[PDB]
Automatic annotation (TrEMBL):
The gene is PAPRA. Signal peptide: none annotated. GO terms for cellular component: extracellular matrix; extracellular space. This is Serralysin. Its cofactor is Ca(2+); Zn(2+). Ca(2+) 3 binds at residues 240, 242, 244, 272, 274, 277. Ca(2+) 2 binds at residues 47, 49, 51, 53, 110. PROSITE patterns: HEMOLYSIN_CALCIUM. Residues 52-211 form the Peptidase metallopeptidase domain. Ca(2+) 9 binds at residues 348, 350, 352, 370, 377. Ca(2+) 7 binds at residues 339, 341, 343, 356, 358, 361. It holds the Pfam family Peptidase_M10_C. Ca(2+) 8 binds at residues 341, 343, 356, 361. Its EC number is 3.4.24.40.
Length: 453
């Protein structure tokens, strides 16, 4: 078998797997299947220029026929609502080839949107219309003494998500399914851990974002939402195409991607167009499980399944926090830093740069191809006696035979050290061809007792 360290890596790596199985008695849908699901109405703005350019207006007066909508008193968006609406619009624009410019309907635009408030509860908390309807572009928001949610929308609260969700609807995204409860969902992932369009909380799928008495809602399009809107209008590859840091020390310039304190409740799906990027969750003291696999979920900031990387996005680096984290790389050359605490770092393919940080860290390898002589991982701060290099997924605990030179037998391993440069290495001949087919180099000596095989 394998060590518990690898099992933990393997477990988390698969913990959020989707497709071809039942969850909560419902079929689990992959991202692509949800994208089909969320665009099942067939409605969309139409372009040609390859981009959908929409204009939008913050209504200053009721439109003709307004009074017949049974909405009561009309009111214009306050400056705060406009501000939040613009951030919400932007977060959609960041991921799909759609643009939102404030202004009156124009001949050259591809459609027009309107935002306004109403005061009669009978109208519902808020609502919008698909782009193929006669009220295409419109989204309305309730505000009265009894319902104050839309009055102060802000990063992380339902007021901001409402804006995001309603705009999503005007873009062509329908709700995940047709009193109803999650039990009536058509697919397992119909919760707001996967999509802001869902009416059901993340607790239905097991994720934990916050506790009772507190609200925590993704401010921007989540994983399936991104997939859905990109299916409709194409992926916007131009956003954040240079190097980008997400989380703490964020350079993404988006409130929902920024963290400044250990108590921040991050709920986002990373959309990124290119460059060498990092998920920096170093400011957190809670245990995290960061997965750089495209389309995968991570447990960040003491929460679970709250962070994800969109399909088609390559994120290269991850920085754990103070807790006992799991860091999982992808096929690219990754820089993974555990931070303080006892971490389990898995590089995956390519030559990775691993940092344990203080504590007692474990560097896991699941396949020979993870770290070869021609493309080897480098653990830049290996602390012998405390850190470990785990090869159990490869050896299945069969053990290794530490020697000074490969004898041609499968399982031979060579622990070397070059004092003059404080550089160490673990070479292994798994195939037994008489030469190393697996290599890991370190900064700091490595001893046979630091290896788990
Ligand atoms: Ca980037
Ligand atoms: Ca990248
Ligand atoms: Ca850590
Ligand atoms: Ca550490
Ligand atoms: Ca990698
Ligand atoms: Ca690797």
């Amino acid at each position: 078998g394998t060590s518990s360290a690898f099992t933990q890596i393997d477990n988390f790596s698969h913990f959020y797997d989707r497709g071809d199985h039942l969850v909560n008695g419902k079929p689990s849908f992959t991202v692509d299947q949800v994208a089909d699901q969320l665009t099942r109405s067939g409605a969309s703005w139409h372009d040609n220029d390859g981009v959908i350019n929409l204009t939008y207006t913050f209504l200053t007066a009721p439109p003709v026929g307004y009074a017949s909508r049974g909405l009561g008193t009309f009111s214009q968006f306050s400056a705060l609502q406009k501000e939040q609406a613009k951030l919400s619009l932007e977060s959609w624009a960041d991921v799909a080839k759609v643009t939102f410019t404030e202004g009156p309907a124009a001949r050259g635009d591809d459609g027009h949107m309107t935002f306004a408030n109403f005061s009669a509860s009978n109208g519902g908390a808020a609502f919008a219309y698909l782009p193929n309807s006669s009220r295409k572009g419109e989204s309305w928001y309730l505000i009265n003494k009894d319902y104050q949610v839309n009055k102060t929308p802000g990063e992380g609260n339902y007021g901001r998500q409402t804006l995001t969700h309603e705009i999503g609807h005007t873009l062509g995204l329908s709700h995940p399914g047709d009193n109803p409860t999650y039990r009536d969902a058509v697919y397992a992932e119909d919760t707001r851990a996967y999509s802001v369009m869902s009416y059901w909380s993340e607790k239905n799928t097991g994720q934990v974002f916050t506790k009772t008495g507190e609200g925590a809602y993704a401010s921007a399009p989540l994983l399936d939402d991104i997939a859905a809107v990109q299916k409709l209008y194409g992926a916007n590859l131009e956003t954040r195409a240079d190097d980008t840091v997400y989380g703490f020390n964020s350079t993404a310039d988006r409130d929902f991607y920024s963290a400044t304190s250990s108590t921040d409740k991050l709920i986002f799906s990373v959309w990124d167009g290119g460059g060498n990027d990092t998920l920096d969750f170093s400011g957190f003291s809670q245990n995290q499980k960061i997965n750089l696999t495209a389309g995968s979920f991570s447990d960040v900031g003491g929460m679970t399944g709250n962070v994800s990387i969109a399909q088609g996005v390559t994120i290269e680096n991850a920085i754990g926090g103070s807790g006992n984290d799991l860091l999982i790389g992808n096929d690219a050359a990754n820089v993974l830093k555990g931070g303080a605490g006892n971490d389990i770092i898995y590089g995956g393919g390519g030559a990775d740069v691993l940092w344990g940080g203080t504590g007692s860290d474990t560097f896991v390898f699941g396949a020979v191809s993870d770290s070869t002589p021609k493309a080897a991982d480098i653990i830049k701060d290996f602390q012998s006696g405390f850190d470990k290099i785990d090869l159990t997924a490869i050896t299945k605990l069969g053990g290794l035979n530490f020697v000074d030179a490969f004898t041609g037998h499968a399982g031979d391993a060579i622990v070397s050290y070059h004092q003059a440069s404080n550089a160490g290495s673990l070479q292994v001949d798994f195939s037994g061809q008489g030469v190393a087919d697996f290599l890991v180099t370190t900064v700091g000596q490595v001893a046979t007792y630091d290896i788990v095989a």
